[PDB]
Design a protein around this ligand. Structure first.
Ligand SMILES: [Mg+2]
Ligand SMILES: [Mg+2]
Ligand SMILES: [Mg+2]
Ligand SMILES: [Mg+2]
Ligand SMILES: [Mg+2]
Ligand SMILES: [Mg+2]
Ligand SMILES: [Mg+2]
Ligand SMILES: [Mg+2]
Ligand SMILES: [Mg+2]
Ligand SMILES: [Mg+2]
Ligand SMILES: [Mg+2]
Ligand SMILES: [Mg+2]
Ligand SMILES: [Mg+2]
Ligand SMILES: [Mg+2]
Ligand SMILES: [Mg+2]
Ligand SMILES: [Mg+2]
Ligand SMILES: [Mg+2]
Ligand SMILES: [Mg+2]
Ligand SMILES: [Mg+2]
Ligand SMILES: [Mg+2]
Ligand SMILES: [Mg+2]
Ligand SMILES: [Mg+2]
Ligand SMILES: [Mg+2]
Ligand SMILES: [Mg+2]
Ligand SMILES: [Mg+2]
Ligand SMILES: [Mg+2]
Ligand SMILES: [Mg+2]
Ligand SMILES: [Mg+2]
Ligand SMILES: [Mg+2]
Ligand SMILES: [Mg+2]
Ligand SMILES: [Mg+2]
Ligand SMILES: [Mg+2]
Ligand SMILES: [Mg+2]
Ligand SMILES: [Mg+2]
Ligand SMILES: [Mg+2]
Ligand SMILES: [Mg+2]
Ligand SMILES: [Mg+2]
Ligand SMILES: [Mg+2]
Ligand SMILES: [Mg+2]
Ligand SMILES: [Mg+2]
Ligand SMILES: [Mg+2]
Ligand SMILES: [Mg+2]
Lengths: 147, 51, 187, 68, 103, 52
RNA sequence: GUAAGAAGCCCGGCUCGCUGGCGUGGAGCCGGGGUGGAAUGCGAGUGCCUAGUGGGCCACUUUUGGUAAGCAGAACUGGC
RNA sequence: UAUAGGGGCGAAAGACUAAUCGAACCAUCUAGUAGCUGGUUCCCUCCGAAGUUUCCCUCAGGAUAGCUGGCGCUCUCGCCC
RNA sequence: CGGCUACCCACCCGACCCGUCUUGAAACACGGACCAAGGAGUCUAACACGUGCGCGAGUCGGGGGCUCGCACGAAAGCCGCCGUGGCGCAAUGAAGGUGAAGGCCGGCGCGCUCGCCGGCCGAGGUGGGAUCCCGAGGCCUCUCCAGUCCGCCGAGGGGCACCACCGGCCCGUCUCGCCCGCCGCGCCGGGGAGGUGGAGCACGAGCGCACGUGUUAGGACCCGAAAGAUGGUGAACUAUG
RNA sequence: AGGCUAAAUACCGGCACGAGACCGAUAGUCAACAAGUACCGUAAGGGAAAGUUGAAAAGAACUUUGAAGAGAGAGUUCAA
């Protein structure tokens, strides 16, 4: 919207919002990231520290495809399966337990949080944190490794 | 041609000492065994070689 | 002139709500009338929070809206929120509590109606409590916004804990000079 | 092409344009910068206060409320 | 040139990008062309079904997508021999045949 | 094709009717209701103009 | 520069792996009791985004170099 | 008729090479770049400066701090303290 | 008769010709003879912040597909076993990798700067903190009695958001000591107490669209060079055979 | 270290075709018109200006001054 643009409002002022003394001409400092070490170090440092140098090993032909492991928390561990399932499976029937298979839900590694109630479940996954493993052992469930 | 298979296996009771046997340490033991498989074989070959 | 003091003519305030929502303007009219005709500072604060913006009305969560009622003294009071109350995927048990908010999400309304609670809007809140008796006025996590974690006196000079802007959080992006003592300096 | 080098004229006026501020608000002063042996005193004192203060302070509060 | 606290930007516009700007103004045009192509195929070619040959159940090679499943390319000659028909006879029946796919 | 607030749309997949911001929105009826006018100060209609 | 109070005084008790003749010292924690604590004026605190500026000059006074300058250079305040 | 541009030709002045020669002309790259001149288009209202710190092959410039504006938020007086 | 006014004239006072560079312009600083038309902060991508809307631990079809051949239809509508995918819900490490819940009660091993068994609570505490709750008390024309009535409050309590501090948890390193288990007892894994580094956790607030400002790269507010490269045209002037 | 092969893809040249929140004769292609035309340079090459009477010419018969250009009358037209 050029009618809401500032340019239509500044018609009449001589220097047009950029001063009579300073005279913004073309490029007074440089272009882009010019002078990262020489004369703009108080802006490259003090606003982006760490920008200059090498940091570690150089993994040639790295893919974001072998390290694929979406993590699931113990808060999210219940709601991968519906609440009707856990209620009608642990409504005082027997010592059975429903299986929450996170691989079908699309998650690989089960990590540990709070809020894991008394009703025990069996979790099938590829990786586990020992926090979540202790939480499942404390609530009385089981831990199954699949692949 | 998708046919997303639904293997349910829902109703089962928690069982015997597999629940006290399938702990976290199995993954770390398998990781250490995979990292130190061949070097132990080299040390066993050297133990058979050095008499 | 006359006044040797500096001129700060308009203080800070937003009187008219900048939103063009007709329903919000009707609620603004109703609670402005109640705020100037009831001497109820509850109606004063609810009128100011209706004047308040979209970002500064953060979404309440269902577990927080439970835990602020779980405190002793909030048995039959109604939780009033100027803002949205959303679902929480964490909790499993929901009490029989009463809600008075704007634009409660669908799963939250469904779980409150399954648990047996009563959701309202501000017109029924005004019909049930003009002075606002029996209400607990709640607010949400303003500082929990991701925008507020980039804000501080610096991004890195007394290490500052304040999250500099970068594309990809990982190796090779802003980790060498000023982030570790082996490459130059360390903050 | 010689220019003016350095001055502090029209500086205190710019300072007092915005009202020079004391930090003026530190209740429960910041604890970093204190002797680590004193920290090994105070943190262990705090966590054993969290552990073993219950029954003696409870009976003492009951006694002073009965005598008061 | 830089400013207050903002992200370091490196746009790839130093090369003469103004010549090669392919904007999809013919995107509904290609959509109507390809609709008429599929409809003309289904009319004039055969009472064979659209997307003619049958595709196999195929698992995706990764540690990422191997839980999922996919319509492959062809029926992997050992599989077609166990089914018991000739190769081009299968191709004319409507069986998609890939001689590369192992088992 | 759209539904009510009780059921979803049976033709569209995941659409519901939006929740209304005000349930009963007759502002004149609300301001003339006895529950509101029970809890008002007083109609103060004096002007109190400038005294020379 | 600092202080002119309720974030302050006073009393009673627990903890300490600090310290150590000593229930000695020192910090932390808990509970209780009393706000009328210099003058004048003022409603305050806080978060984000950003333009312009980055060539100055003059005057009372204190001053450096120069014989002096409508010369060059500093300090407080005011002005252009 | 032959020598055609960083080439020709010069009894040598860097002279001549189509009114242009210490590097011709025409077109393209090309709207080359410029911290450097000039200019920058309607009204009213409100607030309203700086020529200073530090750094830079920095001294006609820029970055940072300061001065400034805009957007709000948290509270408080409004009924012997 | 009245009449301000883009008509003219006179009179009194004030009044140097505009624009910019500049500390300073009416300047013996520069541009402007006059007039009409054209003429300078745009557009794309990216980012940040604020605002507005929809959905909200999710969000988005921008990529395709489906509708009968319709001017507006290059629109719009729908997909859901089209969510592949982008962003967010998890960070810390160079990496192998690891990866955020603790507290209380009772019994026991020497409650021993120490581990086990059963039950319970559950995102910890302190000081501030809008609002909210209980309520002493007194208040309505002449006698006790009452219910809403006119009508506030001493004092106390739970404490939103947010601020300060303490404490706890995760990851990488640092120091000190002890224990546990074996798909097989080893230069095997895991655990504990303190001190640090992190852009973390400590009940999550994001996604998409639009608008405003600012920055960056693109011709980038308009106009401006001495220069460099590529390919061709000239000895009809002149220089020389 | 020998070879063929349609599809989806690209198209600011060309042949016809349709539409436009675009410009409206100093704008839009250089060119709405005898436009790569007039014209310039030896040549490579450079390169314009220039639309509108009226509905229909019904474009003003005839008289008169002047050698004619040009007028004065008259006439056509809703209007010279
Ligand atoms: Mg101005
Ligand atoms: Mg500038
Ligand atoms: Mg005045
Ligand atoms: Mg200077
Ligand atoms: Mg700037
Ligand atoms: Mg280019
Ligand atoms: Mg600006
Ligand atoms: Mg300057
Ligand atoms: Mg001087
Ligand atoms: Mg001077
Ligand atoms: Mg003055
Ligand atoms: Mg050359
Ligand atoms: Mg010549
Ligand atoms: Mg030269
Ligand atoms: Mg040259
Ligand atoms: Mg230009
Ligand atoms: Mg002012
Ligand atoms: Mg230097
Ligand atoms: Mg300088
Ligand atoms: Mg200048
Ligand atoms: Mg600045
Ligand atoms: Mg301000
Ligand atoms: Mg100036
Ligand atoms: Mg000068
Ligand atoms: Mg002049
Ligand atoms: Mg002139
Ligand atoms: Mg004009
Ligand atoms: Mg926003
Ligand atoms: Mg996905
Ligand atoms: Mg140029
Ligand atoms: Mg060069
Ligand atoms: Mg050549
Ligand atoms: Mg000749
Ligand atoms: Mg000669
Ligand atoms: Mg071949
Ligand atoms: Mg070949
Ligand atoms: Mg092809
Ligand atoms: Mg015209
Ligand atoms: Mg033209
Ligand atoms: Mg005609
Ligand atoms: Mg005649
Ligand atoms: Mg007419």
């Amino acid at each position: 919207p050029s009618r809401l643009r500032k340019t239509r409002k500044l018609r009449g002022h001589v220097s047009h919002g950029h001063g009579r003394i300073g005279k913004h001409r073309k490029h007074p400092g440089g272009r882009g990231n010019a002078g990262g070490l020489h004369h703009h170090r108080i802006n490259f440092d003090k606003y982006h520290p760490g920008y200059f140098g090498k940091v570690g090993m150089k993994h040639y032909h790295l893919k974001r495809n072998q390290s694929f492991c979406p993590t699931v928390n113990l808060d999210k561990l219940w709601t991968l399966v519906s609440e009707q399932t856990r209620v009608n499976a642990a409504k005082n029937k027997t010592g059975a337990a429903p299986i929450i298979d996170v691989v079908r839900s699309g998650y690989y590694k089960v990590l540990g949080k709070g809020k894991l109630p008394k009703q025990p479940v069996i979790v099938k996954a590829k990786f586990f944190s020992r926090r979540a493993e202790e939480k499942i052992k404390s609530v009385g469930g089981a831990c199954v490794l699949v692949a | 041609p998708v046919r997303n298979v639904y293997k349910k296996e829902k109703a089962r009771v928690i069982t015997e000492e597999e629940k006290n046997f399938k702990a976290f340490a199995s993954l770390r033991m398998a990781r250490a065994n995979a990292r130190l498989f061949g070097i132990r074989a080299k040390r066993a070959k050297e133990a058979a070689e050095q008499d | 002139g006359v006044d040797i003091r500096h001129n700060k003519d308009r203080k800070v305030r937003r009187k008219e709500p900048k939103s063009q929502d007709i329903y919000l303007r009707l609620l603004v009219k109703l609670y402005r009338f109640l705020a100037r005709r009831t001497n109820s500072t509850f109606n004063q604060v609810v009128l100011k929070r209706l004047f308040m913006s979209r970002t500064n009305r953060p979404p309440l969560s269902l577990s927080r809206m439970i835990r602020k009622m779980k405190l002793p003294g909030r048995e039959n009071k109604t939780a009033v929120v100027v803002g949205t109350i959303t679902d929480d995927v964490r909790v499993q048990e929901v009490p029989k509590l009463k809600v008075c908010a704007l634009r409660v999400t669908s799963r939250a309304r469904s779980r409150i109606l399954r648990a047996g609670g009563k959701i309202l809007t501000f017109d029924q809140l005004a019909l049930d409590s003009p002075k606002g008796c029996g209400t607990v006025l709640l607010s949400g996590p303003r500082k929990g916004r991701e925008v507020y974690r980039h804000f501080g006196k610096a991004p890195g000079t007394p290490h500052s804990h304040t999250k500099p802007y970068v594309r990809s959080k990982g190796r090779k992006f802003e980790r060498a000079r000023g982030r570790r003592a082996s490459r130059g300096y360390k903050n | 092409a010689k220019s003016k080098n350095h001055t502090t004229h029209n500086q205190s006026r710019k300072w007092h344009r915005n009202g020079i501020k004391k930090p003026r608000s530190q209740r429960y002063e910041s604890l970093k910068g204190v002797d680590p042996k004193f920290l090994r005193n105070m943190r262990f004192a705090k966590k054993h206060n969290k552990k073993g203060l219950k029954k003696m302070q409870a009976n003492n509060a009951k006694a002073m409320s009965a005598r008061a | 040139a830089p400013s207050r606290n903002g992200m370091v930007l490196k746009p790839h516009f130093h090369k003469d990008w103004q010549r090669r700007v392919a904007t999809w103004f013919n995107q509904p045009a290609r959509k109507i062309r390809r609709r008429k192509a599929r409809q003309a195929k289904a009319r004039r070619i055969a009472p064979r079904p659209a997307s003619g040959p049958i595709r196999p159940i195929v698992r995706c090679p990764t540690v990422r997508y191997h839980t999922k499943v996919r319509a492959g390319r062809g029926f992997s000659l050992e599989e077609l021999r166990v089914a018991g028909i000739h190769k081009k006879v299968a191709r004319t029946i409507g069986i998609s045949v890939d001689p590369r796919r192992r088992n | 094709l759209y539904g009510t607030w009780r059921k979803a749309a049976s033709l569209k997949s995941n659409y519901n009717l939006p929740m209304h911001k005000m349930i009963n929105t007759d502002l004149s009826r609300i301001l003339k209701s006895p529950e509101i006018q029970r809890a008002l100060r007083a109609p103060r209609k004096k002007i109190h103009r400038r005294v020379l």
